[PDB]
Amino acid sequence: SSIAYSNNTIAIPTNFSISITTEVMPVSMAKTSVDCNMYICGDSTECAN
Amino acid sequence: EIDKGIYQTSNFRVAPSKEVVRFPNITNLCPFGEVFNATTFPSVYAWER
């Protein structure tokens, strides 16, 4: 971009526009739960012991 | 001592009692006696299968 610096000049807007922007924010994650034996062992009595 | 709330629990309710064995319909007995009682065996260098 070309920007010209001046000691006695100012640029002022003469019109305006309305801009609507989106911002997506994660707020939560899936709640998970696990079981000791059913995962590590399953249904084995000896493995549970 | 348990305070007010909701908790997940492991399965202590039911454990297996019976057993279900299913084997194939085979009635013949392997001839171990005849094999181990053979009057001649191969040399180690000419072992059979």
User: What is the token pair recorded at A33?
Assistant: 């739960």
**Residues in contact with A4: Cβ distance below 8 Å, sequence separation at least 6, in sequence order:** none
Q: Which of B10, B14, B20 to mutate to test the interface with A (most CBs of A within 10 A)?
A: B10
Long-range contacts of A27-32 (CB under 8 A, 24+ apart): none
Answer positive or negative: Cα dihedral of B34, B40, B45, B48.
negative
Do the Cβ atoms of A37 and B9 come closer than 8 Å? Answer: no
Dist CA A6 CA B13 (whole Å): 84
Name every chain B residue with its beta carbon within 8 A of the beta carbon of A38.
10-11
CA A17 distance to own-chain centroid: 28
Solving technique for this entry? Answer: cryo-EM
Long-range contacts of A35-43 (CB under 8 A, 24+ apart): A35/B8, A35/B10, A36/B10, A37/B10, A37/B11, A38/B10, A38/B11, A43/B16
**Residues in contact with B27: Cβ distance below 8 Å, sequence separation at least 6, in sequence order:** none
Do the Cβ atoms of B47 and B41 come closer than 8 Å? Answer: no
B11 and A33 within 8 Å at the Cβ level: the answer is no
User: What is the token pair recorded at A38?
Assistant: 């059913």
User: Residue B41 to residues A2, B32, B36: CA-CA distances in angstroms?
Assistant: 101, 14, 9
Q: Closest Cα partner for B15 from A8, A20, A37?
A: A37
